[PDB]
Paper text:
SapL1 was co-crystallized with α-methyl-fucoside and the structure of the complex was solved by molecular replacement at 2.3 Å resolution in the P21 space group using the coordinates of FleA (PDB code 4D4U34) as the search model. The asymmetric unit contained two monomers, assembled as a dimer with all 295 amino acids visible apart of the N-terminal methionine. SapL1 folds into the canonical six-bladed β-propeller with six-binding sites at the interface between blades typical for this family of lectin. Due to divergence in the tandem repeat sequence forming each blade of the propeller, the six binding sites of SapL1 monomer are not equivalent, but they share important conserved features. Hydrophobic interactions are observed between the C6 of the fucose and at least three residues of the protein (mainly isoleucine, tryptophan/tyrosine and leucine). The O2 and O3 hydroxyls make strong hydrogen bonds with a conserved triad of amino acids consisting of an arginine, a glutamic acid and a tryptophan. The O2 hydroxyl seemed to be the most versatile position, since it established interactions with an adjacent loop only present in four of the six binding sites (BPs 2, 4, 5 and 6). This is particularly interesting since the binding pockets that do not contain this loop (BPs 1 and 3) were mostly occupied by glycerol instead of fucose, indicating that those interactions could be responsible for enhancing the affinity and should be explored for development of inhibitors. The overall fold of SapL1 and FleA as well as the overall dimer are very similar with a rsmd of 1.2 and 1.26 Å, respectively. The affinity of SapL1 for L-fucose and α-methyl-fucoside was determined by Isothermal Titration Calorimetry (ITC) and the Kd was found to be 225 ± 1.52 µM and 190 ± 1.44 µM, respectively with stoichiometry fixed to 1 since the measurements were done in the presence of an excess of ligand.
Numbering used by the authors:
A (entry chain AAA), B (entry chain BBB): 2 to 295
Write the structure that this text describes.
Amino acid sequence: SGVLQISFPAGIAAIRNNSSLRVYEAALDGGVREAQYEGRWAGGKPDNVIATGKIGTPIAATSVGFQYIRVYYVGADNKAREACWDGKGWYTGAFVKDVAPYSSIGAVFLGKNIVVRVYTQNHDNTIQEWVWDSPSTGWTAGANFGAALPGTAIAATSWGAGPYHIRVYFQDTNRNVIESGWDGSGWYTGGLKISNQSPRASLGATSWGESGSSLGIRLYYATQDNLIKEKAWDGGGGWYDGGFQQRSIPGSRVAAIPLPVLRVYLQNGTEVSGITEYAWNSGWVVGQAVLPPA
Amino acid sequence: SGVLQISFPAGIAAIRNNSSLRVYEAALDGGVREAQYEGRWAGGKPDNVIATGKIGTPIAATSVGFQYIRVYYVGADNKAREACWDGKGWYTGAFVKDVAPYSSIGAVFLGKNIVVRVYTQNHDNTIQEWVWDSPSTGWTAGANFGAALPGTAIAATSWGAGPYHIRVYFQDTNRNVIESGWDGSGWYTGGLKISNQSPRASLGATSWGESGSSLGIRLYYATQDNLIKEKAWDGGGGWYDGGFQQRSIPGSRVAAIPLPVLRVYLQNGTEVSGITEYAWNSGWVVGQAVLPPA
Ligand SMILES: CO[C@@H]1O[C@@H](C)[C@@H](O)[C@@H](O)[C@@H]1O
Ligand SMILES: CO[C@@H]1O[C@@H](C)[C@@H](O)[C@@H](O)[C@@H]1O
Ligand SMILES: CO[C@@H]1O[C@@H](C)[C@@H](O)[C@@H](O)[C@@H]1O
Ligand SMILES: CO[C@@H]1O[C@@H](C)[C@@H](O)[C@@H](O)[C@@H]1O
Ligand SMILES: CO[C@@H]1O[C@@H](C)[C@@H](O)[C@@H](O)[C@@H]1O
Ligand SMILES: CO[C@@H]1O[C@@H](C)[C@@H](O)[C@@H](O)[C@@H]1O
Ligand SMILES: CO[C@@H]1O[C@@H](C)[C@@H](O)[C@@H](O)[C@@H]1O
Ligand SMILES: CO[C@@H]1O[C@@H](C)[C@@H](O)[C@@H](O)[C@@H]1O
Ligand SMILES: CO[C@@H]1O[C@@H](C)[C@@H](O)[C@@H](O)[C@@H]1O
């Protein structure tokens, strides 16, 4: 066990391809460790580092199956960087952007083609989108959502193609959790608002289905009491308070992968620094008490 | 603006000569910054750095008036190090000791001569005493309190001249806050016990008076739900829950300087990452909403 090498609190990101999972956790030296679920849990060790950022790096991960994985982290040079998987080994990606030293990161693949959005916080504390549509044009600026709380968590999810549907959750300068939305016709301010939350309260999103009845979105958020709670959206909506409620360590990040393998990853104190998996199976249960390298 | 350079959460240390205060706060690049109170608050800026540790460095600070100041921090190499003041300018101390990567620091002067104790957590997770008695002998290993919780906070306070009195507060492997005492005739387990507290809950001790009726000890500590509360010992005895109960950011540190200039420093989310001063004046009040560099 080298669970004590895991940060307290760690940056956490999670992806899945069917019942194959990956969880990316921050080591306390800035190392971004991969944990693998392939019918059992492995990795999280020093030889599972896919890159090194600064101590306290946020992690954001996104994928198209396991055909393409992209993991985002912040270096000690206050630049967001990118680790890449294209089926035959990890490599450094072209994504390099200056961020506020306290910036969080969100990232999404758009549809089943290799199209990427990354959301970071500028020095001026605005949320800026980064766009990759193809190699010819490379990384460009997309939308800037304006002033956000300095240090805000940033949580992004996408579903659909033609058009793509994107939601980005972050805190405004009055500590409210708000939502930036895109459905093909410009960015708007969404229906989701959690009033007057804790400064830099952690945020995690997942989504499943398509626009209409099948659609689901879950947004996991820190309460001022070191709980992680859940806002939920299904089909045509009405945001509501979901059943997920769990005690966490102060500052726990949270990451979610979607139904039908709905899992939520946080730090609740197990083995001190270890990450815990919660699983929806007609009700919340302990999916795995502590992730590798425990 | 400048206050956004302070870590979230930040190591905090405080000392005082009469009504002259010094507060040491960690910048989010590991910078150890000095705020000064000389009838008004100043400092906290980049040209007030006295030393640079790893991001999330703990800070311990101890003084004999303002004739002698010692400030302890952890470097990027997992070595606890010292910045010194002898009344003529800041220099690098001889104290360089290996520490677990997540180690805290407690440090005390013993009496009015130049005698120092530093408490750290070793790689094996034991609490280690470092002894400085004179130049002839230099830094030596002292007592070892055994297994502690990996990443425990460490708070240390001393009073008295001969015998010297030392109390060291830290978290055992069962998450209980416990006390190591020295009254001149060997170390013992003290009466202070705070059962099954949050793994690595912050800790801050001040003491005043002398063994006898005039003795004060105040131990500030973090609760599971982001309050800082207080354990109080007055002269003769009986630990009691103190009046001091404030809301904090997740993982806020706490530092305190003794009555009759009793002030508690913590991070409650004012200007996001600013340190707030509480004052004792027949009841707890706000003394300084936000410390420099804000
Ligand atoms: C062998 O390939 C496995 O699956 C890939 C999707 C990556 O997660 C890689 O780190 C892992 O070793
Ligand atoms: C081919 O380019 C690689 O993958 C693209 C989808 C981007 O993530 C890019 O930064 C990376 O270098
Ligand atoms: C049409 O409403 C938009 O899409 C839904 C899926 C929700 O994200 C809602 O808050 C948003 O405003
Ligand atoms: C049926 O309940 C709703 O959807 C489930 C998938 C869970 O997210 C639950 O917390 C939520 O209230
Ligand atoms: C049946 O296994 C459940 O689903 C897997 C895909 C993992 O999330 C595992 O930890 C969980 O117990
Ligand atoms: C004389 O040596 C200086 O003062 C002593 C009290 C110690 O703090 C030592 O590390 C420092 O270099
Ligand atoms: C006499 O009791 C000893 O000294 C007191 C000042 C307290 O620190 C107590 O916990 C300790 O065990
Ligand atoms: C009687 O009041 C006690 O001593 C004061 C000096 C404060 O520490 C207060 O919180 C404590 O309850
Ligand atoms: C006289 O003013 C009070 O005491 C000073 C020594 C400082 O603690 C100051 O911030 C506080 O308001």
